Structures are given as C-alpha cells and as structure tokens.
C-alpha cells in the first residue's frame, strides 16, 4: 500500500500549470458625414428658398 501510494504521490507532485493569455481588442471606426444646405435668397422680388 505504501509503494502504491508513493507512485501516485509522484504523479501528484506536479507544479501548478500557469498559462499566459493574450486576448487583443482591435477597434476600427471610419466615418463620413456630408450635409448640404442650398440657399437662394432675394428679397427684392420676395423670392427666397
């Protein structure tokens, strides 16, 4: 029994396993906004849009 336990003990005497986890976040945002106000104002003939 002592020997069997010793063999298992040998298996157990294992270093805790560390892992380095590198998860990377990549965010890309591309933005285009165009607004056009087209304006014709004349008050002489009262024409204005």
């Amino acid at each position: 029994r002592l020997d069997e336990l010793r063999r298992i003990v040998s298996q157990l005497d294992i270093p805790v396993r560390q892992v380095m986890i590198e998860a990377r976040i990549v965010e890309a945002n591309v933005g285009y906004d165009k607004s056009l106000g087209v304006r014709w104002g004349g008050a002489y003939h009262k024409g204005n849009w």
Partner: peptide, 26 residues
C-alpha cells in the same frame, strides 16, 4: 390660408421685402 406651409397674406396685411422674405424663408 394655406396649411402645409400655411399662408394667408391678409393677416400680415394687417402687419413686402422684409415681411415676405422672412415669412417665405421656409
């Protein structure tokens, strides 16, 4: 008077180059 872009020139006849310009800005 209109409605969609309401207009009734008599009411502001009570009130041309200045009044209509603004009124008609729309």
């Amino acid at each position: 008077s209109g409605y969609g872009k309401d207009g009734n020139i008599g009411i502001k006849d009570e009130d041309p180059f200045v009044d209509l310009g603004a009124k008609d800005a729309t």
